[PDB]
Amino acid sequence: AQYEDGKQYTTLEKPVAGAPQVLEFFSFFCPHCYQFEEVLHISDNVKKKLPEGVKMTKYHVNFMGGDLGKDLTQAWAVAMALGVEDKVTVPLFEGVQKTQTIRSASDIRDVFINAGIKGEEYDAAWNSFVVKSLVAQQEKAAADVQLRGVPAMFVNGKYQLNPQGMDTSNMDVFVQQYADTVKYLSEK
């Protein structure tokens, strides 16, 4: 077969019922997640190859970066609650991994302020039980797959992308192989 279990993807032995159709996990501490966002734009190219009848979900993980890792998962919840993912994703990556100016929750907050979210607005969201449940949603989804590594993408709670099984001599070719695989899996 052109697409094969163990090549472009693997099959979960305990599939997750009711999961999001297309679910990616990332960490702002994760070097490959940095590439996936700024250099490869994986999420955008996957969306361009799915129909407008499929929802895409992106969740942060706790297991990288200790205390600041958990702050960033809550900050991602704030970003999702306020709908400002596209405004804060790049400054958070660059602040953690490029300039290394994100060292505390206050520094994360500064990113949002500089991106234009009001201080009262950030703080009220940060402390809300709506954000508390968005944090719980991110944890529950990663725990359903005993997630131990990022970047990760899962399709219909049944299949996990296997980027190590694709060709990386060319960055655009890799991105389109990856996105075509998500499409094939979504249609499965």
Ligand X SMILES: Cc1nc(CCN(C)C(=O)Cc2ccc(Oc3ccc(C#N)c(C)c3)cc2)no1
Q: Residue 163 interacts with ligand X (CB under 6 A)?
A: yes
Rounded to a whole number of angstroms, the minimum distance from the CB of residue 144 to ligand X is 16
For ligand X, the binding residue among 124, 136, 143, 171 (CB under 6 A) is 171
Smallest gap from residue 34 Cβ to ligand X (A): 9
Tell me: does residue 173 bind ligand X (CB under 6 A).
no
SS3 label, residue 25:
strand
CA–CA separation, 73 and 111 (whole Å): 15
Q: CA angle at residue 160 from 159 to 161, to 5 degrees?
A: 120
Q: What is the dihedral of CA 173, 152, 160, 137, to 10 degrees?
A: -140
Q: Per rule CB under 6 A, is residue 152 in the interface with ligand X? A: yes
Is the CB of 165 or the CB of 184 nearer to ligand X? 165
CA 148 to chain centre: 14
Q: Omega before 151 cis (within 30°)?
A: yes
Query: CA-CA distance, 37 to 131, in Å (whole number)?
Result: 24
Question: Residue 85 CB, nearest distance to ligand X (Å)?
Answer: 21
**From 60, 151, 155, 179, residue interacting with ligand X (rule: CB under 6 A):** 151
CA gap 131, 108 in Å, rounded: 16
Residue nearest to ligand X (CB): 149
User: Quick one: which segment of 55-63, 71-79, 133-141, 146-154 binds ligand X (CB under 6 A)?
Assistant: 146-154
**Alpha carbon distance 173, 169 (integer Å):** 8
Is the Cβ of residue 82 or residue 90 nearer to ligand X in the bound state? 90
- Considering only 35, 57, 97, 156, the residue that binds ligand X (CB under 6 A) is 35
Count of chain residues binding ligand X (CB under 6 A): 14
Distance between CA atoms of 88 and 122, rounded to whole angstroms? 12
For ligand X, the binding residue among 47, 174, 176, 177 (CB under 6 A) is 174
For ligand X, the binding residues (CB under 6 A) are 32, 35, 39-40, 149-152, 162-164, 168, 171, 174
